[PDB]
């Protein structure tokens, strides 16, 4: 919203983020790719142990539908905490 | 050690696929060059005296 | 990281001790030879799970980036975690138990 506000300012005026905002911007613009590759890795993890679509790993094949179904957000720690919760349920 | 993998077949296949993934990422993202960088490092000093 | 690594250790130890205790209670056997008999039943995934987790976390540490360095604080501690777990479950607990043990899809949606 502040970016659009600056877009409303007269021409010749730019903007940039520094400190914490720059770090979060650098995380966010590359977060989807790393999250996708981590999801692929964890899918291989939940596809290699019970030998392929054997018994449960075919129902974990339905997990991506639940993931896509899932403005409220979550912090960086909880994004790995959800994966760890999935892993601990898998181990259970 | 073979019996460890014979009774667990598709896991070796999974390892093969992750080897393909690593190799593809390496061959794509590496500074691929036609020839080895045999050229020694060079330091250039420039000064101007109008 | 190591906090999440804590919970994956006790399972193997408790399985080992329950097997040892059932063996001694059934055979009236001293703990040493009972344990020596005891490994030939549970040689299964408890090591294989650690092996698989180490394998899946193996190629995460070869890519760079600040977010990658952050993820190392999880990945390296995890691989060390199951490596220590597979060491301890086959090394330490047997010695103890030998030396101390006295004689709906919509519902999921």
From Swiss-Prot, chain A:
Q: Which residues form a coiled coil?
A: none
Transmembrane ranges, per UniProt, are 31-50, 57-70, 76-92
Compartments, as annotated in UniProt: Cell inner membrane
Chain ranges sitting on the Cytoplasmic side read: 51-56
Induction details: Induced by EvgA, probably via YdeO.
Q: Which residues lie on this side of the membrane: Periplasmic?
A: 71-75
> How the protein assembles, per its UniProt entry?
Homotrimer. Part of the tripartite efflux system MdtEF-TolC, which is composed of an inner membrane transporter, MdtF, a membrane fusion protein, MdtE, and an outer membrane component, TolC. The complex forms a large protein conduit and can translocate molecules across both the inner and outer membranes.
Q: Which family does it belong to?
A: Belongs to the resistance-nodulation-cell division (RND) (TC 2.A.6) family.
Job description of the protein: Part of the tripartite efflux system MdtEF-TolC, which confers resistance to compounds such as rhodamine 6G, erythromycin, doxorubicin, ethidium bromide, TPP, SDS, deoxycholate, crystal violet and benzalkonium.
UniProt protein name: Multidrug resistance protein MdtF
- Please name the source species: Escherichia coli (strain K12)
The taxonomy runs: Bacteria, Pseudomonadati, Pseudomonadota, Gammaproteobacteria, Enterobacterales
Q: Which residues of the full protein are shown?
A: 841 to 939 of 1037
């Amino acid at each position: 919203f502040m970016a659009d506000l600056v877009a409303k300012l007269p021409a010749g005026v730019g903007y940039s983020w520094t400190g914490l905002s720059y770090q979060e911007a650098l995380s966010s613009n590359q977060a989807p790719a790393l999250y996708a590759i981590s999801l692929v890795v964890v899918f291989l993890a939940l596809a290699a142990l019970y030998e392929s679509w054997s018994i449960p790993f075919s129902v974990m094949l339905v997990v991506p539908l639940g993931v896509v179904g899932a403005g409220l957000s979550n912090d960086v720690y909880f994004q790995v905490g959800l994966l760890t919760t999935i892993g601990l349920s898998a181990k259970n | 050690m073979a019996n460890y993998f014979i009774d667990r077949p598709v896991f070796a296949w999974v390892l093969a696929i992750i080897m393909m993934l690593a190799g593809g990422l390496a061959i794509m993202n590496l500074p691929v060059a036609q020839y080895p960088q045999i050229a020694p490092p060079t330091i250039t000093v420039s000064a101007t005296y109008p | 990281g190591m906090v999440l690594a804590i919970g994956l250790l006790v399972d193997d130890a408790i399985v080992v001790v329950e097997n040892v205790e059932r063996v001694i209670a059934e055979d009236k056997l001293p703990p040493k030879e009972a344990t020596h008999k005891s490994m030939g039943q549970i040689q299964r995934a408890l090591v294989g799970i650690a092996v698989v987790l180490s394998a899946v976390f193996m190629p995460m540490a070869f890519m760079s980036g600040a977010t990658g360095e952050i993820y190392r604080q999880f990945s390296i501690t995890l691989i060390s975690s199951m490596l220590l777990s597979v060491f301890v479950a086959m090394s330490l607990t047997p010695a103890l138990c030998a030396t101390i043990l006295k004689a709906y899809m919509v519902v999921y949606l």
